[model samples]
Target: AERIAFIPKLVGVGFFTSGGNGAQEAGKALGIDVTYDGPTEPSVSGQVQLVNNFVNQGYDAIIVSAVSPDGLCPALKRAMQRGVKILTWDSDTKPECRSYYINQGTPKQLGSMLVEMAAHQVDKEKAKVAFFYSSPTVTDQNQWVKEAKAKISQEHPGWEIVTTQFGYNDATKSLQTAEGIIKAYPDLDAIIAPDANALPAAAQAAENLKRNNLAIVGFSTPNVMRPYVQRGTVKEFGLWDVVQQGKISVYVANALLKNMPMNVGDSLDIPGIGKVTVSPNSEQGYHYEAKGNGIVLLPERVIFNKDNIDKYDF
Candidate 1:
């Protein structure tokens, strides 16, 4: 109908850039104006100002990959009060801030995937694993960490989490932190880095330290993590199709503009993607559920190694 603005954690990062490419195309396909803009640095205030500006511009809908959970709630709530459709995708805010969250996968599914992938390469018995994450404030990554821990305790009790570090999603910081972790814990067998930059940085850390035995596993796209897998620094990693995620989110925004049904069990037929169903917020690892607010999960998350890495362009 009108314009939709997508606020990512930062602008021009590989992951978020891919999302923008798809989102802009989806906007064209649906005949709407789409603006993908964010801070060059990942900052809460940067995103807050963008949301407020979009509302001031009188856009029809806003999509956000939150810099921190609840950081943009006040602006989002104000936008909603002004009849702007609010949606959160990738990272999320408090569910009350957005009408729907376009999720890549549920927490249990994604969390267990990270654990199982590491367990696949590294021995589960007495395994010493470290978690390198984006930041503690991001709700999605934190929930995945919690689920990964719960799964480990339930099934692989012998595995111990030696330490955890937050890279703030910076490539240089993640590399330095990974090197420090590897140096400190010579006995560490695995590292689960669920952030895009952290995966390659952790691999580079192992290469830089000349330690090839470390099993690096977590969420990163095929393109970013491909060379490491080819070089044997990382065996496998996981990520959903972020481009599809972007396209689907725009379609969801368009749906909302049309006053489409979005209740639990309701579904939308997103072009190029199959039927996407609405699930409760609890499915997204939220403590509570909202009536109109729900989740539409992406269909698949891929585990990439040398075998299938190049098949994916992004």
Candidate 2:
């Protein structure tokens, strides 16, 4: 019997909790045993220890939504060496560390959407922006910012990036940081709070200060941003359905355990998940995809606004 371990970037956060729920849904549907847990904080060391523990517990497949990309590498690599199948999702380690990565979407794809969302609500030439990031260790967010910057450089070179603040996945601190920027820069056009906690925290700051003119945007879940979107504080933000992210990872891990090889261009049509196709990891803007390393991209980069926010609950 194959068992799968699901470790998210962190636990206790609403975003990851929904992902965990989705993991169970898929596991039950497929008749596979799934275990889920993670560090309370987004701590690299804590996450690394969990990876090692999961491997020792003899899970056939270990799926991780990494806190830090390369920081989790040595532990994950050792798990693979011990013959544990490694699959990464949400945030990935180096390509060689996992057989296949379950990507919600490519960094550039997400980055482009994040930038475009800001552009939609703000003036390109006059926009003075700040990015509310979780951490430098959270590699995927780093790449998303980079991709956003690349697009900004070419199209909106006049846009000024005033600051990039790290919230470190702390909500109260994110609120403090958002408040500081809103008060300090009266002319600030937008703040991109990219973390699950940061976006909502930023919106709360905006509401607290009555800074209704300040535009808040980022990659965040609909439910977390729902009240803000409903109250007309946050207009729109981008995110892949995190439930689908967890569901797809479980499906992929189960497939890997069943000895089903995933070559590039192969597709798996998951019920309630629709058809997902495997592509090269390099397509996800990563360098060095190993022999068996591939990416099964999840569906949709959804931008949630007031009109459609009620349709989904997660």
Candidate 3:
């Protein structure tokens, strides 16, 4: 591995930055140059341009957590044609777009996990909850919510889901939406915020109204949600170690460079996750089904509470 570059959807976000930091750590350990790249805001076209740049530069490997699955296919394919090693992480591009995916957790795992966390936090025999997502149009977040809804219906029959709404994955709109939920349903037991933008904003709304009774939980890196957790505005939440996830993606990229026989359904041992198995490609619709490198999910999610809330920065 001579040189590797990590281009996440965005650089400023805690999730991608932490993952990028993991890549830098791996690069240092392997004695390789790891160029951390990507736009502050996630733009598919910007990533495509960067991919072309990396291809032209003739880097050993390029790791990306894409914003759109199909939007990046052309650029990634072009890079692959140049004999550049490619890997996808987090949100992904289409099959044939890259070699492997370092997934934090599947929709199924997160869907059920979130519902359970909220249920435990509220301690309700039966409760009505609203799912305030980041965006309705974003495929990845919607897909997770879809899976979570199905899981919630099947597992917790007594739980009545009030209404699933979105903040358009925007911070200001999400805050207003949280206020609307609070005013509309004074009896609402909990809020399940499924996007990073939604979680902290919603938590702030809850705090503003001094509604300590409404248990709030959702998906986001812990750092953004720490303030709410510290003040008891949010009781519990769940997320993957974004940094560890980045480390795994680099590991897979290096393994591919070494000619490791990775493919869909193949299993490989990661430093932290023993025998991490790759699921069939595009099990969801977002990944590239490469011949040798396969998609790998993290071992498990940590459902953080007050006790361990301060342990992680993001």
Candidate 4:
């Protein structure tokens, strides 16, 4: 039997934990040995070690949500040289590092969605908003922030970006950053965190400061953001089906391992996700591939609020 490792940015976190659960579901359905493992903290060095271990152990494939875009390139490129099938989901690495990338949404889609959510909660004509993300250099987060900032400028010109902050996806650091944002801008209208850890941490900071009326919106699992949503501290947050993304990553890995065709314009009949197309990457400032490398977008992303938030557990 072929062996596959589902490696996330971190282990024991709600978002990636739920993603691992999805990978297990796919493993059972596809009759492959799928193992989930990663660092407890989001560390490039730690994830690199896990990748090295998997490579030395002769794992057939590796699916990762990279911590840093280029930090893992050398290790992943080494794995590719060793003939291991490499794929990335949720977060991505340099294009040459993986055979395929599974993205939840394009920068435009996610950025616009995030800004729209925050805009909905505040009077755009007179709102003081700030962005809180994992880090300034995290590829996926930076891409989203760029587009989100443009959208805010174009659509809500009156809204002011009071500041931008980073938490590096660490719980304590995220909470501290959140508190700092609140402290620096006491009259802040909204805090947008486009990170799984940062969003909830910001929400908790709001709760801690008794600013339940402040708008908190970003990306996170339903389980992590549900309590805040219920208490009206977080009106809404958004994410694609994380478990489905996990399952699809495994399927893509299986196909690549079996020497299936996966290039631009090709489509795969992924279980639970229906037909997914491989498209050319058009992301600026990133390397593009004409063949072997491709992009697969999740079918849809969801906005979780009080009413529909109960329907999802992760």
Q: What is the C-alpha RMSD of each candidate to the true structure, in Å?
A: 1.1, 1.2, 2.7, 1.4
Ten contiguous residues with the weakest lDDT in model 1: 284-293
Tens-place lDDT per residue, model 2, 288-310, is 75556798887777888988888
Off by over 4 Å in 3: 157-160, 167-170, 265-275, 282-290
Q: What TM-score number comes out for model 2?
A: 0.97
- How much lDDT does candidate 2 score? 0.84
lDDT of 3 at 227: 86
lDDT of 1 by residue, 1-314 (tens): 59999888987579999998899999999999999899887888999999999999999999999978888899999999999999998988998888889999998999989988988999657879999988888888998999999999898989989999989888888889999999999999999999998889999999999997789998887878878988889888989899989999999999889888888889888767889999898887677776678998998888887788878875
Better of 2 and 3 by TM-score: 2
TM-score, model 1 to reference? 0.98
Q: Global lDDT of each model?
A: 0.89, 0.84, 0.78, 0.87
Candidate 4: tens digits of C-alpha lDDT, residues 105-160: 78888998998898788855878899999888787889899999999999988889
lDDT accuracy of residue 204 in candidate 2: 94
Off by over 4 Å in 1: none
**TM-scores across all candidates?**
0.98, 0.97, 0.87, 0.96
Per residue, candidate 3 scores C-alpha lDDT tens digits across 1-314 of 48898997766667677888988887777677889999766677788889889888899899987777778888888888888888888776665677777777777777778878877877866888889975554546666888888877887777888887777556788899988898888879889987777888889998788886888888888888888887878878888888877778777777778877776766767665567777766566453444575668887678877799778763
Name model 2 segments beyond 4 Å from true.
Answer: none
Identify the leading candidate in terms of lDDT. Answer: 1
Collision count of model 3: 4
